Structures are given as structure tokens and as C-alpha cells.
Design an enzyme around this catalytic site. Structure first.
Site, mmCIF file in Angstrom:
data_model
loop_
_atom_site.group_PDB
_atom_site.id
_atom_site.type_symbol
_atom_site.label_atom_id
_atom_site.label_comp_id
_atom_site.label_asym_id
_atom_site.label_seq_id
_atom_site.Cartn_x
_atom_site.Cartn_y
_atom_site.Cartn_z
ATOM 1 N N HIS A 142 0.660 -1.191 -0.029
ATOM 2 C CA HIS A 142 0.098 -0.031 -0.067
ATOM 3 C C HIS A 142 1.061 1.287 0.050
ATOM 4 O O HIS A 142 0.757 2.237 -0.791
ATOM 5 C CB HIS A 142 -0.914 -0.071 1.165
ATOM 6 C CG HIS A 142 -1.855 1.167 1.433
ATOM 7 N ND1 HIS A 142 -3.320 1.227 1.495
ATOM 8 C CD2 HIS A 142 -1.285 2.555 2.008
ATOM 9 C CE1 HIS A 142 -3.440 2.459 1.714
ATOM 10 N NE2 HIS A 142 -2.384 3.192 2.083
ATOM 11 N N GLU A 143 1.835 1.298 0.872
ATOM 12 C CA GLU A 143 2.671 2.558 0.950
ATOM 13 C C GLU A 143 3.597 2.595 -0.217
ATOM 14 O O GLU A 143 3.448 3.966 -0.930
ATOM 15 C CB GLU A 143 3.596 2.556 2.088
ATOM 16 C CG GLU A 143 3.071 2.237 3.569
ATOM 17 C CD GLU A 143 2.062 3.302 3.870
ATOM 18 O OE1 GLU A 143 1.888 4.277 3.043
ATOM 19 O OE2 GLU A 143 1.095 2.910 4.864
ATOM 20 N N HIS A 146 1.651 4.310 -3.245
ATOM 21 C CA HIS A 146 1.591 5.620 -3.009
ATOM 22 C C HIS A 146 2.687 6.441 -3.936
ATOM 23 O O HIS A 146 2.640 7.315 -4.619
ATOM 24 C CB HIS A 146 1.644 6.412 -1.719
ATOM 25 C CG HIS A 146 0.313 6.290 -0.794
ATOM 26 N ND1 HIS A 146 -0.999 6.870 -1.623
ATOM 27 C CD2 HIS A 146 0.154 5.462 0.189
ATOM 28 C CE1 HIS A 146 -1.699 6.565 -0.497
ATOM 29 N NE2 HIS A 146 -1.355 5.793 0.434
ATOM 30 N N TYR A 157 -3.880 14.343 -2.683
ATOM 31 C CA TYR A 157 -4.451 13.816 -1.450
ATOM 32 C C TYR A 157 -5.631 14.464 -0.547
ATOM 33 O O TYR A 157 -5.401 14.479 0.567
ATOM 34 C CB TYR A 157 -3.282 13.449 -0.361
ATOM 35 C CG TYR A 157 -3.378 12.231 0.328
ATOM 36 C CD1 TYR A 157 -3.663 10.978 -0.273
ATOM 37 C CD2 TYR A 157 -3.401 12.409 1.592
ATOM 38 C CE1 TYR A 157 -3.605 9.899 0.528
ATOM 39 C CE2 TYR A 157 -3.531 11.186 2.334
ATOM 40 C CZ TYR A 157 -3.649 9.913 2.021
ATOM 41 O OH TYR A 157 -3.845 9.052 2.910
ATOM 42 N N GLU A 166 -6.123 6.669 -2.215
ATOM 43 C CA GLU A 166 -6.122 5.536 -1.128
ATOM 44 C C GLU A 166 -6.586 4.100 -1.730
ATOM 45 O O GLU A 166 -6.198 3.122 -1.204
ATOM 46 C CB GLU A 166 -6.991 6.052 0.222
ATOM 47 C CG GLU A 166 -6.382 6.802 1.223
ATOM 48 C CD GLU A 166 -5.106 5.951 1.722
ATOM 49 O OE1 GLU A 166 -5.372 4.804 2.107
ATOM 50 O OE2 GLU A 166 -4.190 6.571 1.842
ATOM 51 N N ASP A 226 -9.703 13.648 8.046
ATOM 52 C CA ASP A 226 -8.855 12.859 7.182
ATOM 53 C C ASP A 226 -8.981 13.215 5.732
ATOM 54 O O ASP A 226 -9.244 12.393 4.655
ATOM 55 C CB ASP A 226 -9.813 11.539 7.176
ATOM 56 C CG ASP A 226 -8.925 10.272 6.611
ATOM 57 O OD1 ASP A 226 -8.027 10.217 6.728
ATOM 58 O OD2 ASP A 226 -9.802 9.482 6.100
ATOM 59 N N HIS A 231 -9.631 7.883 3.689
ATOM 60 C CA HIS A 231 -9.303 6.674 4.313
ATOM 61 C C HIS A 231 -11.045 6.249 4.196
ATOM 62 O O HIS A 231 -11.056 4.825 4.836
ATOM 63 C CB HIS A 231 -8.655 6.469 5.204
ATOM 64 C CG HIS A 231 -7.153 6.623 5.306
ATOM 65 N ND1 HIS A 231 -6.740 7.999 5.616
ATOM 66 C CD2 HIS A 231 -6.076 5.966 4.832
ATOM 67 C CE1 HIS A 231 -5.410 7.996 5.559
ATOM 68 N NE2 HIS A 231 -5.127 6.984 5.020
#
Ligand SMILES: CC[C@H](C)[C@H](N)C(=O)N[C@@H](CCCC[NH3+])C(=O)O
Ligand SMILES: [Ca+2]
Ligand SMILES: [Ca+2]
Ligand SMILES: [Ca+2]
Ligand SMILES: [Ca+2]
Ligand SMILES: [Zn+2]
Length: 316
Positions: A142-143, A146, A157, A166, A226, A231
Site C-alpha cells: 500500500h505505501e 503511493h 491527497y 487511497e 481525514d 480513508h
């Protein structure tokens, strides 16, 4: 560092033994020279100065408790590199073999992981909410995804573009977890979240509402928390992606599944050829439709299922 390529051995966060690519020059460093311009893993030493120190070990054995988050960050960055190269013909996150850098032991009790614009960063967790977060292949993938997104579509974002950003990370984080094929699922972060509680996760792609996230556009969050719900609202797209792959009937709308490989091909093409920094959910539907048309043809089942899945989650 300049040195010779070696193969160390250690244990990861969950206690599994694995081989790691290292570099020897006085010490053995967590520097994998076998993938692109290198995979490099650093110790942040419980502080927040980044990247910290390139990880040095005297004997090429990584079985200490303190070593485990490093082992997994290093190893799972390699798996993620392999997924992008072998499945999508992409060489690292920039498509030109950029070095992949990660730091572990970030801060104290830090219950998160992130891409900081340049590298990966992993907390150790507080031991109750999380254990060290590099223990989750889906979290690592996931990271790193990005970084891919930032180099390609460049989705801002915030708000809907941010929720797409996301969701793309959750989709490819999950597809990497299936590629490695250990204990794969459509949940996010289950291997590192709440060690005292079995069967939970941060988010579910199969049923976002299990953890309070919307599964239909009519339920979208429009407040300011958020970054405008990046998310939270990701659940709408995550559900669509789940439906495209696996099929199902959702709010009475039936989708014929086309499988994970096609889901990945359609979304990778959308990400790299059609999405832009300001894309909203309607524009994502258009990009996925165009991508599936390119790959499979306008009258294909694949196109039909993309449309049905977005219909099912209320995105026109
Ligand atoms: C992929 C999971 C990873 C921890 C990611 N940065 C994330 O989803 N974080 C969100 C969930 C909470 C993480 C721990 N508090 C977040 O809102 O930051
Ligand atoms: Ca050692
Ligand atoms: Ca799993
Ligand atoms: Ca998972
Ligand atoms: Ca748990
Ligand atoms: Zn993220």
C-alpha cells in the site's frame, strides 16, 4: 555502500524465517543490489530524523527482536518490486529503477506507516493497536503504491481524488498480497492490527461497512476530517474493485466477476494512462471503462462488469 552482494537470513515480525539480500563491506548492510538501483533499509532508532542509518549487522543473521521489522520491510519491498516488474512490466515506482528506501523503528509507539514523498516509514506500533507495521505485506505494498501513484496519475491527497489515491493503494496492496500467496485476503492490515483480537483489520474491501466505511456514493463523507475522508470514501472504490474481481450482488445490482489479474490490468492502465491529479470518482469510472475497452474491447464482459460495478456503488 560499495560492496559485494550477499544473502543473509533472519526472522520477520510474525516469526517466519526468510532470506534477505544484503551487501558486505565490513558490516552486512540491508542493501539489496538484485532489484533495480537497490532496495535500502534504515534504522530510525526510535527517533523521527529520516532516513536514519543504513541498517548494519555484524554477522548477516537477523534473528533479534529488534531486527524483525527491518527484515520484513526489506523483504516485502522486494516482493512489491517483483510484482510491479513481473506483472506490469514497471521497474520500480518511477518506472526507471529508482532506489527504494525504507526506515523502521520510527518514533516510539507509532501506530502507522507512510510514504513521505521520498521513502517508506514504519512505526513499531504501541503493541496493543499495532505490532510493527512492516509485518503486513499489504501495508508495505500500500505505501509503495503511493510512490507509484505520485509518479503517474498524481492524484491530489484530498476529497475524491484522495479517496481514489487511497483505494489504488488498497487495491494494489491486496493484489501484491495475493501475488506472494501466503495468507491472502481482501482485508487491509490484518496481520499487524490488534494482536489481542482475531479476525479484524483496518478496512475491508469486500465489506467496507464492517469498519464504518461507505460502500455506496450516497453514503459518502463530505466533512473535513481525514483530508475530506480519503480513508473513508476509499470504501466506495474498494467495493467496486472487489465486485469487478469477485462478482456479487450489491444493493440489488449484480456484477459478473472477471478475476484479480484483469482487475489489476484495468486499474494499472487507468492509473498510468488516464487518471490525472484532479480526477473524481466519475472520472475514475470513465478511465476504467476506457482502459477495459483498450484491453478487451467495447462489447466485452470486462467492460460490462466495470460498468456494473460502478453502477452498484452509485458512481455514474
Ligand atoms: C495501509 C495501512 C497504513 C497503516 C496506512 N497509512 C493507513 O491506512 N493509515 C490510516 C489508518 C490508520 C492507521 C493507524 N492509525 C490512517 O488513517 O492513517
Ligand atoms: Ca546479526
Ligand atoms: Ca492476509
Ligand atoms: Ca490483507
Ligand atoms: Ca487483530
Ligand atoms: Zn495510504
Amino acid at each position: 555502500i560499495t560492496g559485494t552482494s550477499t544473502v543473509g537470513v533472519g526472522r520477520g515480525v510474525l516469526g517466519d524465517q526468510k532470506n534477505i539480500n544484503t551487501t558486505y563491506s565490513t558490516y552486512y548492510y540491508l542493501q539489496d543490489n538484485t532489484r533495480g538501483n537497490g532496495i535500502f533499509t534504515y534504522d530510525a532508532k526510535y527517533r523521527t530524523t529520516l532516513p536514519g542509518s543504513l541498517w548494519a549487522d555484524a554477522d548477516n543473521q537477523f534473528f533479534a527482536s529488534y531486527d524483525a521489522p527491518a527484515v520484513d520491510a526489506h523483504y516485502y519491498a522486494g516482493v512489491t518490486y517483483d510484482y510491479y516488474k513481473n506483472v506490469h512490466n514497471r521497474l520500480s515506482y518511477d518506472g526507471n529503477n529508482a532506489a527504494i528506501r525504507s526506515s523502521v523503528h520510527y518514533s516510539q509507539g507509532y501506530n502507522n506507516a507512510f510514504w513521505n514523498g521520498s521513502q517508506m516509514v514504519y512505526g513499531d506500533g504501541d503493541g496493543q493497536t499495532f505490532i510493527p507495521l512492516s509485518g503486513g505485506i499489504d501495508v508495505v505494498a500500500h505505501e509503495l503504491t503511493h510512490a507509484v501513484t505520485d509518479y503517474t496519475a498524481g492524484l491530489i491527497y484530498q476529497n475524491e481524488s484522495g479517496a481514489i489515491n487511497e483505494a489504488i493503494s488498497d487495491i494494489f496492496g491486496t493484489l501484491v498480497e495475493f501475488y506472494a500467496n501466503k495468507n491472502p485476503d481482501w482485508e487491509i492490515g490484518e496481520d499487524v492490527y490488534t494482536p489481542g483480537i482475531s479476525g479484524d483489520s483496518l478496512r475491508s474491501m469486500s465489506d467496507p461497512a464492517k469498519y464504518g466505511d461507505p460502500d455506496h456514493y450516497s453514503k459518502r463523507y463530505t466533512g473535513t476530517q481525514d483530508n475530506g475522508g480519503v480513508h473513508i470514501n476509499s470504501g466506495i472504490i474498494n467495493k467496486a474493485a472487489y465486485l469487478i474481481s469477485q462478482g456479487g450482488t450489491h444493493y440489488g445490482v449484480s456484477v459478473v466477476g472477471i478475476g484479480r489479474d484483469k482487475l489489476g490490468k484495468i486499474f494499472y492502465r487507468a492509473l498510468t494512462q488516464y487518471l490525472t491529479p484532479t480526477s473524481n470518482f466519475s472520472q475514475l469510472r470513465a478511465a476504467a471503462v476506457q482502459s477495459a475497452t483498450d484491453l478487451y474491447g467495447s462489447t466485452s464482459q470486462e467492460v460490462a462488469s466495470v460498468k456494473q460495478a460502478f453502477d452498484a456503488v452509485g458512481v455514474k
